[PDB]
C-alpha cells in the first residue's frame, strides 16, 4: 500500500473536554489581564502601595 | 470569601511597604480584585456591586497590614459623582479606618462633608454606621476629643442641621456614644 493505494487525513480531533474548557476560560482570563493592563497604563490611575 | 482569606500575620517585622511586594497569595487575590475593578470600570454590571465588594476586600487588607493603611483609595469613591452603594461602602470603610488608625484630618473631612454634601442618604448612613462603628470611644479617650472636637460637634448639633430632623437625631446619638451623660471632661 506503501506506493499504489492512498488515504485521507483529518489530523485533528483535540477533544479533550476539560482541558479544552481549561484552553478557553485561560484565555478568557488571558484577555481579563490584558485590557487590565491597557487601561491600567492609559487612563487615570492610582495605586495600592506607592508607585506601582 | 476572598476578602474572608484574612490573613492578618503575614509581616512579622515591617512587610508593608512593598516590601516583599508582598506575599504570595495574597498579590493573587490582589490580582482579582484588581480585575474585577476594572472590569467594573469597563462593564459595569448592575450597581457596581462587585466594585462595592471588593472595597470591602481591599480594607480588610488594610486591616491586616497588606496593603498600607491609607484612605485615599477608599476617599476618592467616597467622592460626589459616583453611585451611592459605592460611595455608602467607602464610608463605611474610612469610618472604620477612623477608628482604628487615629486618622484626625480624615475624621475632620467627614464632618464637613456631613455638613456639605447634597445626599441626604449618605448623610444619614454616615452617622448611622459611625455611630455603630465609632471612633474616639467614651473614656478611652486617647484621641483627644476634648480640645476642639466637641466645640464643632456642639455646633453641629445646634448648626447647619436645620435641614432635617434625623442629621441632628444622629448627632445626638454621636454624644449619646461619645460622652453620653456628661461633661466631655473639659472643664
Given at each position: 500500500x506503501x506506493x499504489x493505494x492512498x488515504x485521507x487525513x483529518x489530523x485533528x480531533x483535540x477533544x479533550x473536554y476539560q482541558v479544552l474548557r481549561e484552553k478557553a476560560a485561560s484565555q478568557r482570563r488571558d484577555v481579563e489581564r490584558a485590557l487590565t493592563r491597557f487601561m491600567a497604563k492609559t487612563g487615570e490611575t492610582q495605586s495600592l502601595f506607592k508607585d506601582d | 470569601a476572598l476578602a474572608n482569606?484574612?490573613?492578618?500575620?503575614?509581616?512579622?517585622?515591617?512587610?508593608?511597604?512593598?516590601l516583599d511586594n508582598l506575599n504570595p497569595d495574597v498579590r493573587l487575590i490582589l490580582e482579582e480584585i484588581t480585575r474585577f475593578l476594572n472590569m467594573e470600570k469597563l462593564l459595569?454590571?448592575?450597581?457596581?456591586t462587585i466594585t462595592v465588594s471588593c472595597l470591602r476586600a481591599i480594607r480588610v487588607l488594610q486591616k491586616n497590614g497588606h496593603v498600607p493603611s491609607d484612605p485615599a483609595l477608599f476617599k476618592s469613591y467616597a467622592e460626589?459623582?459616583?453611585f451611592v452603594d459605592i460611595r455608602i461602602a467607602a464610608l463605611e470603610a474610612v469610618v472604620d479606618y477612623t477608628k482604628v488608625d487615629r486618622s484626625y484630618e480624615e475624621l475632620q473631612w467627614l464632618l464637613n462633608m456631613i455638613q456639605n454634601?447634597?445626599?441626604?442618604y449618605v448623610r444619614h448612613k454616615i452617622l448611622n454606621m459611625l455611630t455603630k462603628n465609632p471612633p474616639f470611644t467614651k473614656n478611652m479617650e486617647?484621641?483627644?476629643?476634648?480640645?476642639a472636637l466637641v466645640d464643632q460637634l456642639w455646633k453641629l448639633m445646634n448648626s447647619?442641621?436645620?435641614?432635617?430632623?434625623r442629621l441632628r437625631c444622629g448627632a445626638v446619638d454621636l454624644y449619646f456614644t461619645l460622652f453620653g451623660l456628661s461633661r466631655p471632661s473639659c472643664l
Open positions: - | 482569606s484574612v490573613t492578618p500575620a503575614v509581616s512579622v517585622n515591617n512587610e508593608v511597604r512593598t459595569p454590571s448592575y450597581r457596581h460626589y459623582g459616583h454634601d447634597p445626599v441626604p486617647s484621641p483627644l476629643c476634648n480640645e447647619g442641621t436645620s435641614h432635617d430632623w
